[PDB]
Coordinates of C-alpha atoms in Angstrom, one line a residue:
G1 CA -18.2 9.3 18.0
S2 CA -20.6 7.3 20.0
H3 CA -20.3 4.0 18.0
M4 CA -17.7 1.2 18.5
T5 CA -16.7 1.4 14.8
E6 CA -17.7 4.1 12.3
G7 CA -15.2 5.4 9.7
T8 CA -13.2 3.7 7.1
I9 CA -11.4 7.0 7.0
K10 CA -9.3 8.0 10.1
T11 CA -8.0 11.6 10.5
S12 CA -7.8 11.9 14.2
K13 CA -4.2 12.1 15.2
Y14 CA -5.0 10.4 18.5
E15 CA -6.8 7.5 16.9
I16 CA -4.0 7.1 14.3
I17 CA -1.3 7.0 17.0
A18 CA -3.4 4.5 19.0
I19 CA -3.8 2.3 15.9
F20 CA -0.1 2.2 15.1
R21 CA 0.7 1.4 18.7
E22 CA -1.7 -1.5 18.7
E23 CA -0.6 -3.0 15.3
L24 CA 3.0 -2.7 16.5
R25 CA 2.0 -4.8 19.6
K26 CA 0.3 -7.4 17.4
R27 CA 3.3 -7.7 15.1
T28 CA 0.9 -6.8 12.3
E29 CA 2.5 -7.2 8.8
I30 CA 3.3 -3.9 7.2
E31 CA 3.7 -3.9 3.4
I32 CA 5.9 -1.2 1.9
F33 CA 5.6 -0.4 -1.8
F34 CA 8.2 1.4 -3.9
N35 CA 8.6 1.3 -7.7
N36 CA 8.6 -2.4 -8.6
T37 CA 9.1 -3.7 -5.2
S38 CA 7.1 -4.7 -2.2
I39 CA 8.5 -5.9 1.1
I40 CA 6.7 -7.3 4.2
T41 CA 8.1 -6.5 7.7
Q42 CA 6.9 -5.3 11.1
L43 CA 6.7 -1.9 12.7
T44 CA 9.8 -1.5 14.9
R45 CA 8.8 1.6 16.8
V46 CA 5.9 4.0 17.3
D47 CA 5.9 7.5 18.9
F48 CA 3.9 10.6 18.8
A49 CA 5.3 11.8 15.5
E50 CA 6.9 8.9 13.6
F51 CA 6.9 5.2 13.0
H52 CA 9.9 3.0 12.2
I53 CA 10.7 0.1 10.1
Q54 CA 13.9 -1.7 9.4
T55 CA 15.2 -3.2 6.2
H56 CA 18.4 -3.7 4.2
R57 CA 16.6 -2.3 1.1
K58 CA 17.1 1.2 -0.2
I59 CA 13.8 3.2 -0.2
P60 CA 13.5 6.4 -2.2
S61 CA 13.4 9.6 0.0
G62 CA 11.7 13.0 -0.3
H63 CA 8.7 11.2 -1.6
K64 CA 5.5 9.8 -0.1
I65 CA 5.6 6.0 0.2
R66 CA 2.6 3.7 0.0
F67 CA 2.0 1.4 2.9
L68 CA -0.5 -1.4 3.8
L69 CA -1.0 -2.5 7.4
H70 CA -2.5 -6.0 7.2
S71 CA -4.6 -5.7 10.3
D72 CA -7.3 -8.1 11.5
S73 CA -9.8 -5.3 11.0
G74 CA -8.9 -4.9 7.4
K75 CA -6.1 -3.5 5.3
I76 CA -5.1 0.0 6.5
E77 CA -3.7 2.0 3.6
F78 CA -1.8 5.2 3.9
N79 CA 1.1 7.2 2.5
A80 CA 4.0 8.5 4.5
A81 CA 7.3 10.4 3.9
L82 CA 10.7 9.3 5.1
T83 CA 12.1 11.7 7.7
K84 CA 15.2 9.9 9.0
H85 CA 17.4 6.9 8.2
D86 CA 20.6 5.3 9.5
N87 CA 22.0 2.0 10.6
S88 CA 20.1 0.2 13.4
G89 CA 23.1 -2.1 14.1
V90 CA 21.2 -5.3 13.6
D91 CA 23.1 -7.3 11.1
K92 CA 23.9 -3.7 10.2
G93 CA 20.4 -2.9 8.9
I94 CA 18.8 0.4 8.1
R95 CA 16.3 2.0 10.5
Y96 CA 13.9 4.2 8.6
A97 CA 11.7 6.8 10.3
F98 CA 8.5 7.9 8.6
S99 CA 6.1 10.6 9.7
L100 CA 2.9 9.2 11.0
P101 CA 0.2 9.4 8.3
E102 CA -2.4 12.1 8.7
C103 CA -5.0 10.0 7.0
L104 CA -5.8 6.3 7.1
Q105 CA -8.2 4.4 4.9
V106 CA -9.4 1.0 6.0
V107 CA -10.0 -1.1 2.9
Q108 CA -11.0 -4.8 2.6
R109 CA -9.4 -4.8 -0.9
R110 CA -5.7 -5.1 -1.7
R111 CA -5.0 -2.1 -4.0
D112 CA -1.5 -3.0 -5.2
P113 CA -0.1 0.3 -6.7
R114 CA 2.5 -1.7 -8.7
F115 CA -0.2 -3.1 -11.0
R116 CA -1.2 -1.4 -14.3
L117 CA -4.2 -2.0 -16.6
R118 CA -3.8 -3.4 -20.2
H119 CA -6.1 -1.9 -22.8
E120 CA -7.2 -1.8 -26.5
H121 CA -7.3 2.0 -26.9
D122 CA -5.1 4.0 -29.3
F123 CA -3.1 5.8 -26.6
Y124 CA 0.3 7.3 -27.3
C125 CA 2.9 9.5 -25.6
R126 CA 4.8 12.1 -27.7
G127 CA 7.3 14.8 -26.8
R128 CA 10.9 15.9 -27.4
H129 CA 14.0 14.7 -25.5
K130 CA 16.4 17.3 -24.0
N131 CA 18.3 17.6 -27.2
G132 CA 15.1 18.4 -29.2
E133 CA 14.8 14.9 -30.7
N134 CA 11.2 13.8 -31.2
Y135 CA 10.0 10.6 -29.4
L136 CA 6.8 8.6 -29.6
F137 CA 5.7 5.8 -27.4
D138 CA 2.7 3.4 -27.3
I139 CA 1.0 3.6 -24.0
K140 CA 0.6 -0.1 -23.3
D141 CA -0.9 0.0 -19.8
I142 CA -1.9 2.6 -17.3
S143 CA -2.7 3.1 -13.6
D144 CA -3.5 6.4 -11.8
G145 CA 0.2 6.6 -10.8
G146 CA 1.9 5.6 -14.0
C147 CA 2.1 3.8 -17.3
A148 CA 4.2 1.6 -19.5
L149 CA 5.4 3.1 -22.7
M150 CA 6.6 0.9 -25.6
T151 CA 8.8 1.5 -28.6
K152 CA 11.2 -0.4 -30.9
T153 CA 13.5 2.5 -31.2
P154 CA 14.2 4.0 -27.7
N155 CA 16.7 6.8 -27.2
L156 CA 18.2 5.0 -24.2
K157 CA 20.5 7.7 -22.9
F158 CA 17.4 9.7 -22.0
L159 CA 15.7 6.8 -20.3
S160 CA 18.0 6.0 -17.4
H161 CA 16.6 5.3 -14.0
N162 CA 14.8 8.4 -12.5
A163 CA 15.4 10.2 -15.7
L164 CA 12.8 12.8 -16.3
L165 CA 10.7 13.2 -19.4
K166 CA 9.4 16.8 -19.1
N167 CA 6.5 18.2 -21.1
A168 CA 5.5 14.7 -22.3
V169 CA 2.1 14.6 -23.8
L170 CA -0.4 11.8 -23.3
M171 CA -2.4 11.4 -26.5
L172 CA -5.6 9.7 -25.2
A173 CA -7.9 9.6 -28.2
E174 CA -11.4 10.4 -27.2
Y175 CA -10.2 11.7 -23.8
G176 CA -8.1 14.5 -25.3
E177 CA -4.5 15.3 -24.4
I178 CA -2.7 15.7 -21.2
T179 CA 0.7 17.3 -20.8
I180 CA 2.7 15.8 -17.9
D181 CA 6.1 15.0 -16.6
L182 CA 7.2 11.4 -16.5
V183 CA 9.9 9.8 -14.2
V184 CA 11.5 6.8 -15.9
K185 CA 11.5 3.9 -13.4
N186 CA 12.3 0.8 -15.3
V187 CA 13.3 -0.3 -18.8
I188 CA 13.1 -3.9 -20.1
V189 CA 13.4 -5.5 -23.5
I190 CA 10.6 -7.9 -24.5
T191 CA 11.4 -10.3 -27.3
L192 CA 8.8 -12.3 -29.2
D193 CA 9.9 -15.5 -30.8
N194 CA 8.0 -17.3 -33.4
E195 CA 12.0 -14.2 -37.0
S196 CA 12.3 -12.1 -33.8
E197 CA 10.9 -8.8 -32.6
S198 CA 12.2 -6.8 -29.6
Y199 CA 10.1 -4.1 -27.9
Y200 CA 11.3 -1.8 -25.2
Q201 CA 9.0 -1.2 -22.3
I202 CA 9.6 1.9 -20.2
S203 CA 7.7 2.0 -16.9
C204 CA 7.0 5.6 -15.8
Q205 CA 5.7 7.4 -12.8
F206 CA 3.3 10.3 -13.5
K207 CA 4.2 13.7 -12.1
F208 CA 0.9 15.4 -12.5
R209 CA 0.7 19.2 -13.0
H210 CA -2.9 19.5 -11.6
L211 CA -5.5 17.4 -9.8
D212 CA -7.5 18.1 -12.9
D213 CA -5.0 16.0 -14.8
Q214 CA -5.1 13.2 -12.3
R215 CA -8.9 13.2 -12.2
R216 CA -9.0 12.9 -16.0
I217 CA -6.6 9.9 -15.7
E218 CA -8.8 8.4 -13.0
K219 CA -11.9 8.7 -15.1
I220 CA -10.2 6.9 -18.0
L221 CA -9.1 4.2 -15.6
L222 CA -12.7 3.7 -14.3
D223 CA -13.6 3.3 -18.0
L224 CA -10.8 0.9 -18.8
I225 CA -11.4 -1.2 -15.6
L226 CA -15.1 -1.4 -16.3
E227 CA -14.4 -2.4 -19.9
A228 CA -11.9 -5.1 -18.7
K229 CA -14.4 -6.5 -16.2
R230 CA -17.2 -6.6 -18.8
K231 CA -14.7 -8.6 -20.9
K232 CA -14.6 -11.5 -18.5

């Protein structure tokens, strides 16, 4: 375009490449999110098709990863899938290659995907495990990417890391029901002391079946967030 600056959304391949090369040169901090974890590092290489980072951590593959480039111009958020990985022979670290993003969004706000919203609503998740056993969970918090489920009587063998809860149903009161697949990410036991009660919290990632399902979730979020703000 004719202006110096214009879009918070970048889709031009040439601009995107140009932006990565510049941030590389400025040693801009890149933040990588996966599951529970966030690491800060720098871009180690930029070419026409891919960008590299190096880290000793294991990062899930075959899945789009959330990034944040903490540029001077604002946070540049994008998703990118891992294409290659091996040992970059620096303290024997791992060199990851990611495909260049095809869309960038410059935001001034830090949108940490690891955070989930607490609420007052009567939301539950019901379904059957692989062996036909019924389960029920309280939906304690929720984001557009996942939720925390809670129960005092978990069937732990079906809740291992990356275990899949297929055909799980989100009972969302006034918002209706949403059948979805959940990927178990993390299980912790929270104990309240005052007699003692232990609650199991299972953190899950949504595997949506349609955009319509995600949009419904996003509308609920906007309602919950608004409610939470009005609560201050």
